[PDB]
Write a protein that binds this ligand. Sequence first.
Ligand code: ANZ
Length: 250
Amino acid sequence: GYVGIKIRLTDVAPQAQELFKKESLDVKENKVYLVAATLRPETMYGQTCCFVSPKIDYGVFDAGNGDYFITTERAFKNMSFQNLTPKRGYYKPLFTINGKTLIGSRIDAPYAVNKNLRVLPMETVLATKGTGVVTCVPSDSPDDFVTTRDLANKPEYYGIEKDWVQTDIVPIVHTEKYGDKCAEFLVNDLKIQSPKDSVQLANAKELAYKEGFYNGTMLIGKYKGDKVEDAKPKVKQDLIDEGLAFVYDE
Ligand SMILES: Nc1ncnc2c1ncn2[C@@H]1O[C@H](COP(=O)(O)O)[C@H]2O[B@-]3(OCc4cc(F)ccc43)O[C@H]21
């Protein structure tokens, strides 16, 4: 399965404000989270934004105890069958919301060293996979790097502001094969120039996974200096113990 990462919504975009007001959902008084699905919890130190898709209608769900989750309905339904929600098999949202409506919102992401994070559009999110929410780590995810490059090179065109997208990458994982920002290395080496180059991106993804997990060393956090292979379960358990993440299966 995946690790779900609880990314706190701190201020909603203007186009969303009316909607949240109507449903008496105040993001400063209730705990409203975008829940991103990841397989690399050890890289959370390097989140530079959170991605949603313009093509997806998300639900805002009651997750109990004053928490609310923003995910696909598919994902929340699965969560209800493994004790992560207030009632087994119950998955009606309070309301639905299209990804475009959330663009520009402000967020706080667990363990991120960068501050002032925003919600940004990713056109290539697979609707049927995970939660439909993907957190952005350009140092080590080739998809994230390439999408970040396109947004930063033409922000006005994509309907975003340039200050929303961060291009100064702080290194998180050291490898001998690809240096300290393996996604940058691989995107250049394989000459990947578009987010829709799917077959090449999958090749880059797997090369990055292998080298990083088995041969990489942490450059940051409590486990700085440890091998990623040893540090990764510890980071995951730390996040879970602190209420910042959970596991779920599909
Ligand atoms: N609906 C969706 N559409 C597109 N991409 C999605 C997605 N849900 C999650 N992801 C992305 O794919 C990784 C798992 O891929 P596989 O399952 O192995 O193919 C996840 O972990 B990862 O999170 C942070 C991260 C950092 C990193 F250095 C590398 C990867 C990721 O990005 C997520």
